[PDB]
């Protein structure tokens, strides 16, 4: 059975229960089948993983697990104990068994142990007992897997979870070698591809990792994740993953934007890609997503296309975005001519900027307040900056009659963006 | 009675019921007394000001207003009809009356009409009936105020609401002359100072504006507002407003950070100011703020962390001492790197330890039991910890013998403005 769906696996504010229920509804409707529960900052998932859910938390989770079963989504419950567990201590192993049994009593039948993003060293006690980190991790994981009656779905996220985190590299790492040899065959392995955020996940990268882990991985895809950069948001199509990976993978679970409503395109296009090969065009999958998303929102299709192009993919701007940048780069490189070419290219660029502003004001006025609030700060930010760029292009055109500086005298604080953070950033090459 | 408290007055996601009731507790605890409801993107406040509350919304607003009374906070309900109102259409007037009457029935007794951030140009039909934009605003505001029974608190926000918006200047504004002359004496005028986000609000500028509006204004203070720049947050102390303003003002309502829990300092130091040294009030606010940060109770964050966090996200026109120190240290290390004395190595090591305190603050805040406090600040703290981590690596690199898309499209355009970093 191929696992396809969403992992809530990002850093920051987790989704709340009704967002999660809505997500299941979306996953079902688009024929996805899986939800992995792993929010880095839900405190009982990681920071205080020893802690039992309270009576009130237990009711909420039981309700959530019932909703998943009601929408035919498999609910995988993850836990992340690696920051401070003593792998050899008797009391630790049973605290973990006790935590997982509680969740099993809520109705959960599928589980995961995640060991990503922790210090690669062991305390003195585990060093007496295990020959390496990998041995400590695989031993606790096999024992938990057995303890729970070998559940049909059990996931392991390695500490070396992408190319970049392999020491010294993927094909020769002693950590992954130990994982491949000793991790029980019914346990799946999570993998994010060559990098944490993979621009592409080439078939030969996956063959290569497959031979060392001794199984087809489940992809934890960070393509649409946006927790690592405050200003960024990803509304472009699922892309850079050939449909030929499907036969070579146990699943793909997408870790998408923090802002719940921003993930319409991320999940809908993943569903299109999946259903295409249970080939795939990213631009046509994007067209279908935006068309259908439009019905949730006055806001036009063309508003949504420009919004997606402005907030597209981690390594790529969309068409309307890449085009505005090119023009601005041109206008700015040729501004000394201030000739009919520059003036008419300027007036077009200013009109393009006007479409950003119109997209902002129509969104601001739409009826779906929930979608507006999740997007608000991205849309405000792009409208403010495009309004400054537009007024800069005007100022360059005005240089034939004015020697005044771009900013005249005392400014409001938003004329200089980024605060102390932005000052450190500007001192980096 | 002097109004001192908070306007929920910013753009973006508004606060929800639970955040607002918590606000009213803090205001009462610190002896503030006023809340002005005015969130720019709460639908029926502005974009859809004509539309009446549904049964479910009425229930919520009523519960909110009862909570204010229960905590002894005066609730002022604002509405912002200026975008598309035809002032001479009696149906527009009646719609405004009926919307306010509906809120009266929820228990509300104080009100505001806001005309900020709108065009000076009236429609043809209004130009018939009124001699100026200010006559149009003043006669609807006077009519509403009399219609509601001359409520003891009624506020008016002018279109010319700070010094730099006043045409041709403050002392000679025809708009403000008419406001000063026609607006009934029981109606208060809102004012943000010399600018939208005022660095200082000098006594003389208040004497100036008061003469033309013929009354002491209520300050709408944007010193801690952060809706205008995604990357900014303000945890430094209320500052730049002399306590000698108090006998010259009818109140101060602070429009603070969009992230509710980030506003502990902004509101605690306003209370201190109201009841003055900014560094002393900062120290009192952070000392009391610390008590909100404990780890959760288990069955199986320091004052110096908070001082550093406030200094990294201080005030719109100044960084806190530790933030300015780190930035000067980094500048120097960078300017003197071609050298690699024992001096640069000594100072690079001390700087790396400073970067480490940033990363430690993030780690300990992530252990906090009040999860709403961590979530409200999360994206600012993650951002400064990521940058510092990169900066510490760069300082290591400059000493070793041996992100291209950061900020996305917006970041790219911004770096192309040849003016970028002009104020650094």
């Amino acid at each position: 059975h191929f696992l396809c769906g969403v992992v809530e696996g990002f850093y920051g504010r987790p989704w709340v229960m009704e967002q999660r229920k809505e997500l299941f509804r979306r996953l079902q409707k688009w024929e996805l089948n899986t939800y992995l529960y792993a929010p880095k900052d839900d405190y009982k998932h990681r920071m205080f993983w020893r802690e039992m859910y309270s009576v009130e938390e237990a009711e909420q989770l039981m309700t959530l697990i019932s909703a998943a079963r009601e929408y035919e989504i498999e609910f995988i419950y993850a836990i992340s104990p690696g920051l401070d567990i003593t792998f050899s201590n008797p009391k630790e192993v049973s605290t973990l068994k006790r935590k997982l049994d509680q969740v099993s009593q809520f109705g959960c039948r599928s589980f995961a142990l995640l060991f990503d993003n922790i210090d690669h060293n062991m305390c003195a006690a585990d060093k007496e007992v295990f020959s390496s980190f990998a041995h400590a991790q695989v031993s606790i994981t096999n024992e938990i897997y057995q303890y729970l009656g070998e559940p049909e779905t059990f996931l392991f996220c390695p500490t070396e979870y992408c190319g970049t985190f392999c020491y010294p590299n993927v094909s020769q790492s002693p950590y992954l070698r130990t994982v491949g040899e000793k991790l029980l065959p019914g346990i799946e392995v999570l993998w994010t591809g060559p990098k944490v955020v993979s621009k592409e996940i080439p078939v030969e990268s996956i063959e290569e990792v497959s031979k060392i882990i001794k199984r087809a991985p489940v992809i934890w895809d960070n393509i649409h994740a946006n927790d690592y950069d405050q200003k960024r948001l990803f509304l472009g199509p699922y892309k850079g993953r050939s449909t030929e990976l499907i036969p070579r993978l146990k699943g793909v679970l997408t870790n998408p934007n923090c802002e719940f409503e921003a993930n319409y395109v991320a999940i809908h296009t993943l569903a299109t890609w999946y259903k295409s090969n249970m080939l795939y065009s990213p631009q046509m999958a994007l067209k279908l997503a935006l068309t259908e998303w439009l019905q949730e929102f006055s806001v036009t299709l063309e508003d949504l296309q420009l919004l997606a192009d402005l907030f597209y993919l981690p390594y790529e701007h969309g068409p309307k975005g890449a085009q505005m940048l090119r023009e601005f780069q041109w206008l700015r490189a040729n501004s000394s001519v201030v000739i009919e070419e520059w003036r008419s290219r300027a007036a077009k660029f200013e009109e393009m900027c006007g479409l950003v502003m119109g997209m902002f004001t129509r969104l601001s006025n739409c009826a779906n307040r929930t979608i507006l609030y999740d997007m608000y700060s991205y849309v405000w930010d792009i409208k403010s900056i495009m309004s400054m760029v537009k007024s800069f292009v005007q100022w360059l055109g005005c240089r034939s009659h004015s020697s005044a500086q771009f900013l005249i005298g005392d400014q409001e604080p938003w004329a200089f963006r980024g605060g102390l953070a932005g000052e450190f950033q500007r001192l980096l090459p | 009675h002097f109004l001192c408290g908070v306007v929920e007055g910013f753009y973006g996601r508004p606060w929800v019921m639970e955040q607002r009731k918590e606000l009213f507790r803090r205001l009462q605890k610190w002896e503030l007394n006023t809340y002005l409801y005015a969130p720019k993107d709460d639908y029926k406040h502005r974009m859809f000001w004509r539309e009446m509350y549904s049964v479910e919304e009425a229930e919520q607003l009523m519960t909110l207003i009862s909570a204010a009374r229960e905590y002894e906070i005066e609730f002022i309900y604002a509405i912002s009809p200026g975008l598309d109102i035809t002032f001479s259409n009696p149906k527009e007037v009646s719609t405004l009356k009926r919307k306010l009457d509906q809120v009266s029935q929820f228990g509300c007794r104080s009100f505001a009409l806001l005309f900020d951030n709108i065009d000076h140009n009236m429609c043809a039909a209004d130009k018939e009936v009124f001699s100026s934009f200010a006559h149009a605003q003043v006669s609807i505001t006077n009519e509403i105020y009399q219609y509601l029974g001359e409520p003891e608190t009624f506020l008016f926000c002018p279109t010319e609401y700070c010094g730099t918006f006043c045409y041709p200047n403050v002392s000679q504004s025809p708009y403000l002359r008419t406001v000063g002359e026609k607006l009934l004496p029981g109606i208060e005028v809102l004012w943000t100072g010399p600018k939208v986000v005022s660095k200082e609000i000098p006594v003389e500028s208040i004497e100036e504006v008061s003469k033309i509006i013929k009354r002491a204004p209520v300050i709408w203070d944007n010193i801690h507002a952060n809706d205008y720049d995604q990357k900014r947050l303000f945890l430094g102390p209320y500052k730049g407003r002399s306590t000698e303003l108090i006998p010259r003002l009818k109140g101060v309502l602070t429009n603070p950070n969009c992230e509710f829990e980030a506003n502990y300092v902004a509101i605690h130091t306003l209370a201190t100011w109201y009841k003055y040294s900014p560094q002393m009030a900062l120290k009192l606010a952070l000392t009391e703020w610390l008590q909100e940060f404990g780890v959760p109770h288990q069955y199986s964050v320091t004052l110096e962390d908070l001082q550093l966090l406030a200094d990294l996200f201080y005030l719109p026109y100044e960084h806190g001492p530790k933030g300015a120190q780190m930035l000067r240290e980094f500048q120097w290390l960078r300017a003197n790197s071609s050298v690699v004395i024992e001096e640069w190595r000594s100072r690079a090591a001390k700087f790396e330890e400073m970067c480490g305190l940033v990363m430690g603050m993030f780690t300990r805040l992530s252990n906090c039991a009040n999860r709403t406090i961590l979530y409200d600040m999360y994206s600012y703290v993650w951002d400064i910890k990521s940058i510092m981590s990169m900066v510490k690596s760069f300082v290591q690199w400059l000493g070793c013998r041996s992100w291209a898309f950061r900020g996305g499209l917006a970041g790219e355009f911004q770096r192309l403005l040849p003016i970028d970093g002009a104020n650094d």
């Binding site: 850093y11 990503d116 993003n117 922790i118 210090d119 690669h120 970049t164 985190f165 944490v196 960070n222 927790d227 690592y228 | 993650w382 910890k385 990521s386 981590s389 990169m390 690596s393 992100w403």
Partner: peptide, 9 residues
């Protein structure tokens, strides 16, 4: 090498 953030390559 935590917080999904390796050093620069």
């Amino acid at each position: 090498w935590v917080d999904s953030t390796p050093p620069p390559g």
